[PDB]
Design a protein around this ligand. Structure first.
Ligand SMILES: [Ca+2]
Ligand SMILES: [Ca+2]
Length: 189
C-alpha cells in the first residue's frame, strides 16, 4: 500500500503515487527491467558525472537493502525522501553524517572528511589537486573540531552544517517539491 510508504517517509500518499511515475522513468533509463541500478539512480540525483557519481552511489548503498546493486520502488522512495526540500533539516544533517561515516563508528576522521570536501566541491563544479584538498581538511577540523580529539562528532557535524548550510546543498533535490505536477527530463549519455 502507498499508505505504508507515506507514513514511514516525508512523502504524502499522493506524492508516493507520483513518485511511482518517476520510478518508471528512472528504472527504464539504462536497462528497462523494472529495477533501479546505480547509473539510473545517478540520473535521478543529477549526479551522472564521474566525480559526482560517488555521492549518488554512496546514497544508493545506504538504501540498497540486500546489497545486490538494485533498488525497487520502496527503497527508491525511502532514498529520495530525505532529499525532499520539506524534509526536516535535522533529518538531512543526520543522514549526511551516516553518509560520510562509512565505518559506522560514530565519528569522521580526515579520510572521511576528505570525501565530504570532495563531494562538497563537486556540487559547486570544482575539482582540486590533492594538496589543496588537504588544506581544506585542515580548516574543516580547525572549525568543526570544538571538542578537540582529532575527530568530528555528530554534534560537531550538526554545528558545522548549521553555520555552513551550503554543505547540505547536495541533500536537497528541488524537483521533489513539484513531483505531483511536473517531471524533469532524464536521459542517459
Ligand atoms: Ca533499470
Ligand atoms: Ca571532535
Amino acid at each position: 500500500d502507498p499508505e505504508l510508504l507515506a507514513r514511514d517517509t516525508v512523502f504524502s500518499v499522493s506524492e508516493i503515487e507520483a513518485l511511482y511515475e518517476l520510478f518508471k522513468k528512472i528504472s527504464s533509463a539504462v536497462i528497462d527491467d523494472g529495477l533501479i541500478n546505480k547509473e539510473e539512480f545517478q540520473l535521478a540525483l543529477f549526479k551522472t558525472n564521474k566525480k559526482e557519481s560517488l555521492f549518488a552511489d554512496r546514497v544508493f548503498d545506504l538504501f540498497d537493502t540486500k546489497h545486490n546493486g538494485i533498488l525497487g520502488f520502496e527503497e527508491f522512495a525511502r532514498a529520495l525522501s530525505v532529499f525532499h526540500p520539506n524534509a526536516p533539516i535535522d533529518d538531512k544533517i543526520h543522514f549526511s553524517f551516516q553518509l560520510y561515516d562509512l565505518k559506522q563508528q560514530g565519528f569522521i576522521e580526515r579520510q572521511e572528511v576528505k570525501q565530504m570536501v570532495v563531494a562538497t566541491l563537486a556540487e559547486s563544479g570544482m575539482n582540486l589537486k590533492d594538496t589543496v584538498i588537504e588544506d581544506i581538511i585542515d580548516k574543516t577540523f580547525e572549525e568543526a573540531d570544538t571538542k578537540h580529539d582529532g575527530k568530528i562528532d555528530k554534534e560537531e557535524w550538526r554545528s558545522l552544517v548549521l553555520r555552513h548550510p551550503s554543505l547540505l546543498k547536495n541533500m536537497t533535490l528541488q524537483y521533489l517539491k513539484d513531483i505531483t505536477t511536473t517531471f524533469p527530463s532524464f536521459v542517459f549519455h
